[PDB]
Amino acid sequence: ANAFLEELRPGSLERECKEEQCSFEEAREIFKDAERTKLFWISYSDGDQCASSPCQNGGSCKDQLQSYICFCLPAFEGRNCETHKDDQLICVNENGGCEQYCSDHTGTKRSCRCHEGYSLLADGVSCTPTVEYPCGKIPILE
Amino acid sequence: TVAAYNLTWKSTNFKTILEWEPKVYTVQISTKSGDWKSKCFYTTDTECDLTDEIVKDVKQTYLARVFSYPEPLYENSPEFTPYLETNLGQPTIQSFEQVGTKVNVTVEDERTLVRRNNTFLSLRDVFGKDLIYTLYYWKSSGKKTAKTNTNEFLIDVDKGENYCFSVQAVIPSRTVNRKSTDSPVECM
Amino acid sequence: IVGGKVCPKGECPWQVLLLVNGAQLCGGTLINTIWVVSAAHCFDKIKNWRNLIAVLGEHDLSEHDGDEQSRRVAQVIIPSTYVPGTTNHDIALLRLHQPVVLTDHVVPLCLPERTFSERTLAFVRFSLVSGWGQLLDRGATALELMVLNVPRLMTQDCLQQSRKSPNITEYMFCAGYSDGSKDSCKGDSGGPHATHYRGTWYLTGIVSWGQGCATVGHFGVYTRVSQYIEWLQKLMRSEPRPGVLLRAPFP
Ligand SMILES: COc1ccc([C@@H](Nc2ccc(C(=N)N)cc2)C(=O)NCc2ccccc2)cc1OC
Ligand SMILES: *[C@@H]1O[C@H](CO)[C@@H](O)[C@H](O)[C@H]1O
Ligand SMILES: *[C@@H]1O[C@@H](C)[C@@H](O)[C@@H](O)[C@@H]1O
Ligand SMILES: C[As](C)(=O)[O-]
Ligand SMILES: [Ca+2]
Ligand SMILES: [Ca+2]
Ligand SMILES: [Ca+2]
Ligand SMILES: [Ca+2]
Ligand SMILES: [Ca+2]
Ligand SMILES: [Ca+2]
Ligand SMILES: [Ca+2]
Ligand SMILES: [Ca+2]
Ligand SMILES: [Ca+2]
């Protein structure tokens, strides 16, 4: 910024760019050198991409050169932490967490079933043998 | 339905996002000998955050494919080993103390998306001796440099005279993306 | 098998051995006490359909023990869409004359549900193929049951990564290596391709065919069991028709 007769004062990085918003020349009026003024300008003028508070669900934004990075809390993913992990309870996602068979259900939660000779336990996802030799098991290893 | 194309990895400080064209899909990510894990189920976005899957072992090399829906139509992304490709964010000068003729310039140990216990590891924690910082300081018309195995610089300054600084994270061993962009400029 | 190892006695309890007039013929896979799943081309040149024997709990073809259970094959069912001498629809359902006794050395492999197999099992990278076939492309068969671990590929990749023979239809998938190090082999035809998922094994493949055995720039081709589940299931609940050979319609 340049007030009345303020330009009469010599250059001051603090007063003009820190304490105030300085233009490019004002800045060039401090460092003098172009290569130097550029190195400084590149960041000083980049703009805090976090200003829009892009990160969601308790995320934490970290500004970058014309970009940002979001650090989400455990239960969230996505460029902006916009993804709820606890809402991926479908069969395509890790077999819906079922030990054997998985069955999607529009709206409600998914169901888990078992193969013959097996029974679905109370946990709703596990299957235990109901016969002495259920398919898929190797006796000398069980 | 057209198979997706131009798959690219966008990774900085391990925050890895796979982007693609053109502008409903499902992405799977795996390691050369691991099972395939579906991510971003039926998204209409041409991107998918895979950060959580790759931070489980940064040293690993991952491969990802994008299935297209109106065996399905897909495309494979380039191989991607985080630890050797993720980009180093823009460093930042945390502080600088002067004791007579010498000045101590510090670089902030920025945090990474890589989790351990209940906290985000810092750039140091993950790379250690692999990461060094380069100082580019000046008064005089010329420039001077300095390098450090840690996150601090200890240089000799001409008493009185004013200086400016600018660091830059570097991982020397790296074949690609071994240098991060320059930090903002700071002057005494 | 090429580049695999000896399945320890008992760790391949569903592996079956097929014999014609007392002669090794092909491998099989037990999916329950009276039904065995094998390969179609295995019966291409059979003549004495009353001389087919199935042997369970077998391991060392040079030694006999109480764990061996032989059974005559009452019926051999093949999709009516299968053409002898060709590759597509290489699957056969064999009914035994008498149920076998499930023991520590004789346990059936599970037949999965279609969607579970297509949506999940299909993505477990590795699986195990086994049998008493050749140990080398040119070489002879093996005395002790051999087993091998192979990675699965989606047809598209299998093609790009393969050298320019039958086409990889949607009724088969590839598994193996192209460096020429490991692969199942001819004498292993009809053998299982069992997948391990969350504590249980399932049938997801059948040693079908290939460009020789473990040839550089080629993978193994296995019948895609998941496309024949309903088929097999209906047949298993159907009444026993006359004649050993039975061409069932498919779908
Ligand atoms: C091109 O098609 C075939 C070629 C070889 C095999 C071949 N079997 C075989 C099995 C597995 C592989 C492999 N893993 N590389 C390799 C080979 C074979 O010699 N069977 C004997 C015979 C030949 C043709 C028809 C019936 C019986 C099977 C094929 O089709 C069923
Ligand atoms: C916040 O501002 C950032 C940085 O430009 C932008 O990319 C976001 O979409 C917005 O929400
Ligand atoms: C930034 O870090 C994230 C992960 C959360 O802990 C936030 O509360 C914090 O602002
Ligand atoms: C397609 As191929 C059987 O040559 O690997
Ligand atoms: Ca001013
Ligand atoms: Ca001014
Ligand atoms: Ca001030
Ligand atoms: Ca002022
Ligand atoms: Ca001026
Ligand atoms: Ca000025
Ligand atoms: Ca001015
Ligand atoms: Ca910025
Ligand atoms: Ca024997």
What Å distances lie between residue B40 and B31, B103, C53, C171, CA to CA?
A: 18, 49, 50, 28
- How many whole angstroms from its chain centre is CA B68? 29
| Interface membership of A139 toward C (CB under 8 Å) | yes
Position A128, amino acid:
T
| Interface membership of A141 toward C (CB under 8 Å) | yes
| Domain total in chain B | 2
Backbone φ and ψ of C108, nearest 5° = -70, 155
Q: Can you give the three-state secondary structure of A10-58, one letter per residue? A: CCCHHHHHHCCCCCHHHHHHHHCCHHHHHHHHHHHCCCCHHHHCCCCCC
Pairing of strands C245-248, C69-79: parallel
Q: Are B84 and B174 in contact (CB under 8 A)?
A: yes
Mutation test of the interface with chain A: which of C128, C198, C232, C233, choosing the one with the most A Cβ atoms within 10 A? C198
C172 lines ligand 1 (CB under 6 A): no
Experimental method: X-ray
Q: Are residues B96 and B73 in the same domain?
A: no
End position of a domain, from candidates B59, B85, B111: B85
Atom from ligand 2 closest to the CA of residue A52: 1
Backbone φ and ψ of B76, nearest 5° = -105, 145
**By C-alpha distance, which of B47, B42, B40 is closest to B7?**
B47
Q: What chain B residue is nearest to C173 in terms of C-alpha separation?
A: B71
Position C129, amino acid:
V
Give the CATH number for residue B148.
2.60.40.10
Q: What chain B residue is nearest to C171 in terms of C-alpha separation?
A: B71
Q: Are C146 and C7 in contact (CB under 8 A)?
A: yes
Q: Among A56, A70, A71, A72, which residue has the most ligand 3 atoms within 8 Å of its CB, making it the best to mutate?
A: A71
SS3 C193: strand
C44 lines ligand 1 (CB under 6 A): yes
Tokens in use for C80? 């009516």
Q: Which residues 8-67 of A have a C-beta within 8 angstroms of B?
A: 13, 31, 33, 36, 39-40, 42-44, 62, 64-65, 67
What Å distances lie between residue B135 and B100, C49, C62, CA to CA?
A: 20, 84, 75
Q: Are B18 and B7 in contact (CB under 8 A)?
A: yes
Environment class of residue B160 by beta-carbon count within 10 Å: exposed (0-12), middle (13-18) or buried (19+)?
Answer: exposed
Q: Can you give the three-state secondary structure of chain B, one letter per residue? A: CCCCEEEEEEEECCEEEEEEECCCEEEEEEECCCCCEEEEEEECCCEEECHHHHCCCCCCCEEEEEEECCCCECCECCCECHHHHCECCCCCEEEEEEECCEEEEEECCCEEEEEECCEEEEHHHHHHHHCEEEEEEECCCCEEEEEECCCEEEEECCCCCCCEECEEEECCCCCCCCECCCCCCEEC
Q: Which residues 22-41 of B have a C-beta within 8 angstroms of C?
A: 28, 30, 33-38
Instruction: Give me the active site residues of C, please.
Output: 41, 90, 189
Angle between helices A24-31 and A34-44 in degrees, nearest 10: 130
> What is the CA angle C135-C136-C141, rounded to 5?
45
> What is the CA angle C129-C130-C135, rounded to 5?
110
**By C-alpha distance, which of C77, C39, C15, C29 is closest to C232?**
C77
Number of residues in chain C: 251
Q: Can you give the three-state secondary structure of C147-183, one letter per residue? A: EEEEEEECHHHHHHCCCCCCCCCCCEEEECCCCCCCE
- Give CATH 2.40.10.10 domain extents, chain C: 1-12+109-226, 13-108+227-240
> What is the CA angle B83-B88-B91, rounded to 5?
145
A62 lines ligand 3 (CB under 6 A): no
Q: Are residues B182 and B111 in the same domain?
A: yes
C85 lines ligand 1 (CB under 6 A): yes
Contacts of C230 (CB under 8 A, 6+ apart): C114, C251
SS3 C42: helix
| Interface membership of A91 toward C (CB under 8 Å) | yes
What Å distances lie between residue C222 and B98, C171, C176, CA to CA?
A: 72, 9, 10
Domain range list for chain A: 12-142
Cα atoms in the 13 Å half-sphere on the side-chain side of C139? 15
A66 lines ligand 2 (CB under 6 A): no
Contacts of C200 (CB under 8 A, 6+ apart): A99, A100, A115, A135, A136, A137, C110
The C-alpha of A107 sits at a distance from chain C's nearest C-alpha, in angstroms, of: 20
Q: Are residues B91 and B37 in the same domain?
A: no
Q: What chain C residue is nearest to B74 in terms of C-alpha separation?
A: C156
Range of the domain at B122: 86-188
Gaps in chain B after residue (C–N beyond 2.5 Å): 23, 70, 139
| Interface membership of A78 toward B (CB under 8 Å) | yes
CA separation for the pair A117, A130 (Å, rounded)? 5
Strand partners, C200: C197
The secondary structure of A82-125 as a DSSP string is -EEGGG--SSTTGGGG-SSEEE--SSS--EEE--TTEEE-TTSS
**Dist. CA A30 → ligand 9 center (Å):** 10
Environment class of residue B67 by beta-carbon count within 10 Å: exposed (0-12), middle (13-18) or buried (19+)?
Answer: buried
**By C-alpha distance, which of C90, C101, C91 is closest to C34?**
C101
Q: Which chains pack against B, by 3+ Cβ pairs within 8 A?
A: A, C
The C-alpha of C176 sits at a distance from chain A's nearest C-alpha, in angstroms, of: 22
Evaluate the CA torsion angle B161, B167, B172, B177 in order and state its sign. negative
Per CATH, domain C1-12+109-226 is 3.40.50.300 = no
CA separation for the pair C39, C91 (Å, rounded)? 4
CA separation for the pair A51, B13 (Å, rounded)? 20
Tokens in use for C24? 């090794």
The C-alpha of C110 sits at a distance from chain A's nearest C-alpha, in angstroms, of: 5
Atom from ligand 3 closest to the CA of residue B120: 4
Atom from ligand 4 closest to the CA of residue C165: 4
Q: What is the DSSP letter of C34?
A: T
Q: Are C130 and C30 in contact (CB under 8 A)?
A: no
**Dist. CA A18 → ligand 5 center (Å):** 10
Provide CATH code, domain C13-108+227-240: 2.40.10.10
Tokens in use for B129? 């001796």
A134 lines ligand 2 (CB under 6 A): no
Cα atoms in the 13 Å half-sphere on the side-chain side of C133? 34
Which position has the token pair 């000046």?
Answer: B138
- How many whole angstroms from its chain centre is CA A118? 41
CA separation for the pair C68, C57 (Å, rounded)? 5
Strand partners, C69: C56
